[PDB]
């Protein structure tokens, strides 16, 4: 799990819109966006994919 050029295949989600429940998997690429009123996210600044 350590490449000389870096690992890009794996991904990680730092933050999510809503809270969680035990034993839950999310399958949505929805976005993290500052406060309220989401952005929905397509690689731009002051929101968060």
């Amino acid at each position, epitope marked *: 799990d350590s490449k000389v050029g870096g690992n890009y295949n794996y991904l990680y989600r730092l933050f999510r819109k809503s809270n969680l429940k035990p034993f839950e998997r999310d399958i949505s690429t929805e976005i993290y*966006q500052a*406060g309220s*009123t989401p*952005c929905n996210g*397509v*690689e731009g600044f*002051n*929101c968060y994919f």
Partner: antibody, heavy 127, light 111 residues
């Protein structure tokens, strides 16, 4: 140090192409702003260049199949391979900024503040 | 090719208040908000003076304001000086994170 500089200016003839460039200095283009405002003196303006990377469906129904452009984040410079340049595009563009909502500047609000520009280049498409 | 109605010729005496508008439609009345007003000395890139219509720009003199209702407008430019003979525009939404704005109100300061 932090400044948007336009470069790559040359003569364009009908049937040819040219690679423009807007280079950011100080702040890397990987996580910064770029808005291409196209200005013709005396009349209204238009923001056209739709390149927010990730390559998904986001485009304006006016320049379909005309303006093609690429992304290069680590080099802190963007290149504009504006193909099929029309002779009725006599205008000096400016790459600029904006404001969103994430960081300390907005915790509650909307954003949208173009605040830092370039100086523009002088490219004329003449027969 | 997309262009909205603005009052091009506006003028006011120094120390007075003037109103600046830019037109939308009924698809813009329910519950959005995105309006930021411009400022241009002609011949160069614009300047930011008003955004987030009824709230605070970071460094800006607080003599300017904006007001919002229905089809009844105001960019309220008050405390006019000799340096206010500049071009003005707004910003606005067009649906699904798209954008449009108005046709360049030009202010001329008399006296």
């Amino acid at each position: 140090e932090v400044q948007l500089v336009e470069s790559g200016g040359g003569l364009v003839q009908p049937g040819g192409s040219l690679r423009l460039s807007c280079a950011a200095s100080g702040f890397t283009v990987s996580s910064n702003y770029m808005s291409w405002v196209r200005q013709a003196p005396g009349k209204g303006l238009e923001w056209v260049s739709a390149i927010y990377s990730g390559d998904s469906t986001y485009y304006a129904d006016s320049v379909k199949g005309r303006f093609t452009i690429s992304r290069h984040n680590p080099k802190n410079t963007l290149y504009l391979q504006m193909n099929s340049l029309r002779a009725e595009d006599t205008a000096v563009y400016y790459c600029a900024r904006l404001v969103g909502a994430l960081t300390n500047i907005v915790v509650s609000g909307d954003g949208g503040a173009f605040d830092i520009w370039g100086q523009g280049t002088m490219v004329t498409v003449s027969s | 090719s997309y262009e909205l109605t603005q009052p091009a010729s506006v003028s006011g005496s120094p120390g007075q208040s003037i109103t600046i508008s830019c037109t939308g439609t009924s698809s813009d009345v329910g519950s959005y908000n995105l309006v930021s007003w411009y400022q241009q000395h002609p011949g160069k890139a614009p300047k930011l003076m008003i955004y987030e219509v009824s709230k605070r720009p970071s460094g800006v003199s607080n003599r300017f304001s904006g007001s919002k209702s229905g089809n009844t407008a105001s960019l309220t430019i008050s405390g006019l000086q000799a340096e206010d003979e500049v071009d003005y525009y707004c910003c606005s939404y067009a649906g699904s994170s798209t954008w449009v704005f108005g046709g360049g109100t030009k202010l001329t300061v008399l006296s």
